[PDB]
Amino acid sequence: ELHPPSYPWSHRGLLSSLDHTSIRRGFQVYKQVCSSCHSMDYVAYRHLVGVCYTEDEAKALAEEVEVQDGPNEDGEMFMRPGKLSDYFPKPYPNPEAARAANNGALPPDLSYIVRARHGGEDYVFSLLTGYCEPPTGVSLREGLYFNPYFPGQAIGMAPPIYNEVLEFDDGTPATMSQVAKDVCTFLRWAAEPEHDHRKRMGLKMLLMMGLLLPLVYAMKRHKWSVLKSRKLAYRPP
Amino acid sequence: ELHPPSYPWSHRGLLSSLDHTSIRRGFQVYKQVCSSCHSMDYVAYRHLVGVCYTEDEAKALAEEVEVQDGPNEDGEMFMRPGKLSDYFPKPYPNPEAARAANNGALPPDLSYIVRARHGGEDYVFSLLTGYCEPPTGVSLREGLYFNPYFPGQAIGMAPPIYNEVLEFDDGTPATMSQVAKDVCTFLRWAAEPEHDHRKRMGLKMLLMMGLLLPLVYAMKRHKWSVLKSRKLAYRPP
Amino acid sequence: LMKIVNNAFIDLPAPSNISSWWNFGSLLGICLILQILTGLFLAMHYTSDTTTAFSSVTHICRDVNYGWIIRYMHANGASMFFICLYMHVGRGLYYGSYTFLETWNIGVILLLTVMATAFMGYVLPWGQMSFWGATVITNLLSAIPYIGTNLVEWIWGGFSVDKATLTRFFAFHFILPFIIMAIAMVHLLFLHETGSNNPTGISSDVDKIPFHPYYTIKDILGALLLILALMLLVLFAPDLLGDPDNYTPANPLNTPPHIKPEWYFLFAYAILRSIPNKLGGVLALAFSILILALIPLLHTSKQRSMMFRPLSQCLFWALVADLLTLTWIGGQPVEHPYITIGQLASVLYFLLILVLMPTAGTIENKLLKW
Amino acid sequence: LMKIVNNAFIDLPAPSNISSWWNFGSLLGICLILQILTGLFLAMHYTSDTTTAFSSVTHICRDVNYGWIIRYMHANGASMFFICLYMHVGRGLYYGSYTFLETWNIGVILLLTVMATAFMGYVLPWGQMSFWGATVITNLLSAIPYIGTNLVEWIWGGFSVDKATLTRFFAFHFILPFIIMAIAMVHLLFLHETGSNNPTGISSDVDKIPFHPYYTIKDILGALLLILALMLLVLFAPDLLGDPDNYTPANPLNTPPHIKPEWYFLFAYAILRSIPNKLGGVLALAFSILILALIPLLHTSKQRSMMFRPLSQCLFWALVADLLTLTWIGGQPVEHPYITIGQLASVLYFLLILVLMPTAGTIENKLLKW
Amino acid sequence: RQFGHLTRVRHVITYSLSPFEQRAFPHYFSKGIPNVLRRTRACILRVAPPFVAFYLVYTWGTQEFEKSKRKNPA
Amino acid sequence: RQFGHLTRVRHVITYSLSPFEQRAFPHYFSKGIPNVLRRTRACILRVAPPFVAFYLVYTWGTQEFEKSKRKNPA
Amino acid sequence: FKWRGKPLFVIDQEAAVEVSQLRDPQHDLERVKKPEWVILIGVCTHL
Ligand code: HEC
Ligand code: HEC
Ligand code: HEM
Ligand code: HEM
Ligand code: HEM
Ligand code: HEM
Known part of the structure; x- marks a missing residue:
């Protein structure tokens, strides 16, 4: 194994949130780069609302891509422009095609x-930025590549990312690093669409429970005070 | 509405079973006639074992028809000869195609x-054998036909059955009637693969419960007999 | 030493003039346990998804080893269940159980627990009467102003019935019998301070007797008749009560020409269907049930039973005509020969209860001077 | 008048030298009700089908209004549940609850009810540790000769885990808490004839006091700490105990390099993993649990507690090292520095219980002449 | 509640016999059948006539409904 | 069971006061903190040393495991 | 069509209907914006 470090973030703090501006550029990456071979099936454009894009804007991307929906009255199926309810375009119809499109290996x-x-993140960010020349005395089949963070240090991961591989909207640098920041920020949002709200209840809880807990601890000590101060004696003849 | 009569059967009796010989010819009908537009999805060839056909014989029909199964390692799908686990060949991939193959109407x-x-049966047997010329003062679109047993007396049912429409194995007459007998015998088996066994427990129950019920009724009357024969009196001064 | 609480089912005082009716009082304990036992093994292969549930029933009736029986021991078992109740409950009127006010109310909360439970049990297989059987009834709660649209959409998990409607019932439906299982003990608890209530209505304290030999086997004898009358239907006529349509797949884009829920609503459903107004009959519906809580303020006779009130018997068995009528009239469609009935039969139901049974004791007291 | 039975929770005699430990004795009533309450609302959107269940979890954590919390109030709630028990149970050893033989056995049947329940609860989402987490444990029951292959295939609904395996658990898993809910009352019943058991171990009949003001709020104070320690995890570290892998979809054609079930088995799973033999450790597993039924024949001291048996404290807190060790050693893989441990730690567990705790009272009696 | 503190009884005698010393079903046909009829003659008049009308209203309910769907001369 | 028929008591006096007539937390810091330490000095010696070894076995458990994956000179 | 889990039902003589003679006095174009594109929730008002 190899243990990634604890890289800081804009959200590592226990009341820290996600830089939504960083997410906005992060989504560009998945569409331009990763959506060729990664099948994110548990998400739709609508979840991006209130996060990185708006209704109409994100809807412009649903108009962009075709989606297989609708049994025609003839009894056949067709393609339409998607909508906000539609989940992301799956790259390949089934896993096996992805294995066929690769050197026998599957994209998760x-x-x-x-x-x-x-x-989580720290694995991924250091994964892309852990590419290097193989060491002495190592051999790998074609299609495989070297990356220490992956178990076995042997992977069919073509290098997806490099400096000036694309460009972003506002015009920030398209380095191998900043891109690697927004993307990992993006994926944490995937398995946590609640981060903005978890901390909110994350905070409401304390200033209640931190406020109640003494009071109940007093009402306890209030009633028990009879016995915290109770004396006895023994007066037989 | 129209109420069908109570036509007798080889299985109407409360300890009567199905003539499996009648089923054996009945299955020929569904494949030659009804399987072009009727989608029986809740059945497989294996359920015919112990009923009308054997393992190897019925398996010969699974070898007959092609079935869409198996993601190829390329990432595609193909056709194979079916097997006993495979359900029946669906005629059409979806309902809408069936509406398209007909005058807007759907086969159930x-x-x-x-x-x-x-x-149930008596509806169906009289349905096919209820075709006649329309009466005076009636008009129907093309594709529709007349049959009194159907609600509205108006149906897009092309006449499926007629005398000498096919031939059967052992060589019994291919009349419009005998064929109509085996087929309705066949469909009752569809929604009752247990008829042969329901009556078996149908019979075991009686010669137990008919035998217990007196005995328990005696053990009742046994214990209560103290009070079924209890006398009293009243002897104060 | 939890052996002393189980004397209530072994060494309990109870009368001796007891009919065969009170078999039914304990068959529910056998129906309920059996029904639970059946359904529990049954849900080993149910699926709470629209795309597979109806098929998941077919997974049972075809491919399971002797599981096909379990669909019917359970389903038609639920009919034999209700056959006990309206022989269990009309009893309390024909004998005067309802004076035990602390118990009679419990006997209601079960009924609304069940009749709202069973409503969630017919719907699981997506029978094309499941859907509309859930639509019509649940749609009525839109009758309320300013909240009816909310709670209904709130329960539909959207704006109309869907997959989300299903699972929300299957949990609400797999659970309440256990809530009933404990309330059963409660229903026997308030009893335990006073015990049972003979047909004569007399306090029979002098002639209370044991329970292990006598009423145990007597109930078992009734359970036999239950299992018989249950084994008969499943083996010989399982399609009798369970309507044919429910074997159809669900499709919102087509209805049957005739709608009716399962037979047992029909005395009650007809009361609503009588009223052309929407809301004006809904409140009558639950009132028709919740009148039972309102009866015991109408025990006019200082007697109890009705074996010794012949006029009450003239009314009481007349009430059964109305129910058994509304049963049939409910399951039939809306046309002129039948609307004329329910406009009377509905009124007769409320009329017999709140006018003439009270009127009896006010007279029968005067017929015998107290 | 069911108001007299609820005096056991209002006007019950109970001691006054009571620690904060016995908060935990009632938190389970709060964990259980909460956990049930959570899970019940949670199963409103679960699906018992392989093709959709894992997705049906995602239906919650994304699309439901504040439902995503419920996955964790329930799940990590089940961890806080067990944190009570092994603080609830080791108590009975450190204080001597286990003399109440009629109660202590009940305290076992819960545990095997739960630890076989929870085993059915981690498996529902098809996490790629659900599957193998169900495979490995259940595979062991093949260890028996001539029936092991039968019952295992019999429970797998085939020859290996599948859709049919799932639904059979979901019903077995949605139900047992209610079976626990009643057994909870039983566990309090045999208590009720004798009441609680102070830390000193002395029969404190003289100093038994009310319950509504004192221990009610005291338990609520503990419930607050529970809800706190529960709200913390879900809000700040929900990925802590629930392993990461379980968010993976299920696939039998690939395993993780490292397997471990949820953390709480690990004291027990390690005992088996120590034994290279297959069956030779299985019987040790349940024996490691069912030893608890076997302890009360090993109360050598004619004292009760261990606040007044200093040597017992030297052993008792040493036992905790073994469990907390086997906890960690269990969750780590099979290699030479760790095998050497479990071959000792497993033996130490059985050794401390059956040799040295008895040996204490045989000595401590002699140290003070009785 | 149980036996012992229910009420008072005075000057009452109870005779009774084992079950074994008597047939279970004596005089079942011989004496039961009149008692069935006597039980019948006390209840039929206050039970049947509702169901009598029910049979008629069940009859006329169909016939009028049967005629209404049949056409009129026009 | 309840109060009234538990046991016998003779020649015992109990004094006690309302809660309102006394502060809830008097002498908390002043007297509690020594009592904490006194409570500590009676328990640490029979509680810690297990956990002391645990910390070591948790230490050596990693180091030996850490070395084993590191190679040997061959 | 299917919509909200409910159906979706979608001029020369339609305007010939006398509104006052009807039960609900309701001109056609009060119900639509375009004459030749009809819309309604396809649910029978009675039950
Ligand atoms: C060439 C198509 C393709 C591209 C483009 C692509 N991926 Fe991959 N991805 C794959 C394949 C194939 C694997 C299989 C890796 C393996 O089998 O270990 C994979 C693996 C991964 C994994 C799995 C890590 C693990 O432990 O196995 C992650 C995370 C990932 N990619 C993220 C990304 C990111 C981030 C990008 C854009 C910077 C990206 N992918 C672009 C195809 C692609
Ligand atoms: C030519 C294609 C075709 C053939 C062959 C065919 N059917 Fe039909 N069937 C249809 C269609 C189309 C309908 C639609 C009826 C309607 O829409 O009302 C239908 C309706 C039915 C129904 C519905 C009855 C009901 O009560 O709803 C049954 C049963 C049926 N067919 C059975 C049969 C039987 C029996 C045969 C052979 C004797 C048969 N089908 C052969 C096309 C066919
Ligand atoms: C008073 C309690 C209950 C009532 C009134 C009731 C009602 C019903 C009815 C009438 C059916 C018939 C469906 C059919 O025949 O197709 C049914 C089906 C079903 N019941 Fe319930 N039920 C009850 C309790 C239970 C219990 C206790 C369970 C599980 C332990 C359960 C689980 C199911 C399942 C999974 C089905 C689907 C099977 C089917 O639809 O055929 N029910 N319910
Ligand atoms: C699962 C449901 C039920 C169970 C388990 C149950 C159980 C019982 C039992 C065992 C008895 C004693 C038998 C007898 O008195 O003949 C009884 C009596 C009674 N039941 Fe039920 N019952 C149920 C439903 C109901 C309902 C729906 C009512 C509606 C009113 C009801 C009202 C009563 C009353 C009033 C009595 C008193 C009997 C008497 O007065 O002698 N119970 N119940
Ligand atoms: C002592 C009782 C129980 C234990 C030990 C237990 C165990 C668990 C655990 C640990 C999970 C975590 C799954 C996850 O985090 O992904 C889970 C999930 C689940 N529990 Fe249970 N559970 C219990 C009771 C219940 C109850 C009472 C219900 C319903 C009333 C229920 C329904 C569910 C469902 C549907 C899931 C799937 C959700 C998921 O996997 O995230 N469980 N169970
Ligand atoms: C849902 C599970 C459980 C519930 C609801 C429950 C409930 C309770 C409650 C309320 C008490 C009194 C509080 C106290 O004594 O501090 C108690 C005591 C006790 N419990 Fe639990 N308990 C559960 C599980 C267990 C388990 C797993 C054991 C295992 C041995 C156990 C053994 C005991 C014993 C021996 C006592 C006696 C207390 C004494 O001796 O003073 N219980 N239980």
């Missing part, structure tokens, strides 16, 4: 991959 | 249609 889903891998 | 399934229609 990326919906809950963060919470389904030790370290 | 025939798995549980008997128990899902008042009268």
